[model samples]
Target: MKKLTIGLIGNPNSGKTTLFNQLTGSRQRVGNWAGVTVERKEGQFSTTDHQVTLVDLPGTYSLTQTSLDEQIACHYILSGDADLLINVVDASNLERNLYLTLQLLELGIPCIVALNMLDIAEKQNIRIEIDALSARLGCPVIPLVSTRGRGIEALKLAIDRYKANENVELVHYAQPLLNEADSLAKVMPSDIPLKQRRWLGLQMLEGDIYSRAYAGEASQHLDAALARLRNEMDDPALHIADARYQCIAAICDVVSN
Candidate 1:
């Protein structure tokens, strides 16, 4: 049986801990992640229907793996151990925070956006239509004021009812990029789960050696994709960000007041 495990993640100061405390209360056990000094917290709570274990991942601004926070967050998410993802997104800084949300969407995980700090965003005169945001993201978006214990019940209910579905593509990417990702997906190692292969393939296409090694030594297709995409990746790392920013730019244009 696949255990119900939820991974909680957010940027630092996004009130991720507050939400974690609210959900798990006194059930949390603290320790360190394997081989790293970063604190890891695991707590369990029952929904109306199921037992759920929530893992509080290190707060990270992005999942680029350039820093420890990012590395830990990305590694756990990519590991396929998490049955669902609760992305703690700040309501006050929707545009900046949405960048990571877009990246998360690309990973094709089943997700729920805990839209926190609604009070602050309202104070800042920012109005976000919850249904509209949900419509665009293709996942549930719960308006949360975690400190006040608001929206927690709804979140629990949403989790109880969550059904895995197709996450929409926010960016209309280059055709070649899509084709290359498909090619790499075909050669992904047997160890990788079928659900995550596409994401790892895209990462490999973006010139990630970690993804390459994680997938396998190398492939004729991987080498060819890189060679063909060389010029297109003016900055292989930043290419991911550039497309995501465009999606974020358009989303903010419509979703916020």
Candidate 2:
């Protein structure tokens, strides 16, 4: 069996740290995420055949790297150091939390949702259908109340059982933006996987600094696309976000109480 590294990510106040502790128990150490002041923590635990090292990522609102902390989380996610990602989300605040979930899914990473804060979600009249959410996510969605250690065992089993399939279309960006992403991705520098390459290109079109830098000389494709988008649509760059919310709303309707 090999050592499995799993990156744990969530939005702020999602009880991500509590979940981390629940999984890792006391076998943990503190450090810093390289190249940033943001705190980093790693902890070890055993699976049936693997020793899992769970790495904590700074909570971020989006994968876009404008803020330093957001950049930290995104870059690490891009680095491919981890074999799997645990996307812990605040179930009570599904709309806001699922934005990052969608973004993480776009990276084409094999991820499982640690659907935390279930008690609060139920109290708020936010009953979620687990099987429905799992189907919508295309991944396991484990319910966990980290503070009470309620779902930790089930989540561990989910981790041990993880295997993945297709990357579905989570958002339908305007056709032009989709075309632009395709062009930019075709010219990407060959480091990232094709799925991640496409995602990087989409971020570049949205004017993400880190993504543009990584695109390197292939960024040449961006020039034509940007000019075309800016010339035609008044808010072409804003379309992805609007589409994301629409997609989220549709999922909420299908999966929520």
| Per-model CA lDDT versus the true structure | 0.81, 0.85
| Candidate 2 accuracy as TM-score | 0.95
**How far is each candidate from the true structure, as Cα RMSD in Å?**
2.3, 1.6
| Residue 103, candidate 1: C-alpha displacement in angstroms | 2.2
- Taking all chains together, each candidate's TM-score versus the true structure is 0.90, 0.95
Give me candidate 1's TM-score against the actual structure. 0.90
CA lDDT for candidate 1: 0.81
Q: Report the number of the highest-TM-score candidate.
A: 2
> Where is the poorest 10-residue window by lDDT in model 2?
162-171
Q: RMSD of candidate 1 to the true fold?
A: 2.3
Q: What lDDT tens digits, residue by residue, belong to model 1 across residues 21-62?
A: 899999989999889998888998888987889999988876
Q: What local lDDT does model 2 show for residue 56?
A: 86
Question: What is the per-residue lDDT of model 2 for residues 11-101, given as tens digits with 9 covering 90 to 100?
Answer: 9999989888887889999988767677888999987767899998888988881677788888889898999999988989988899999
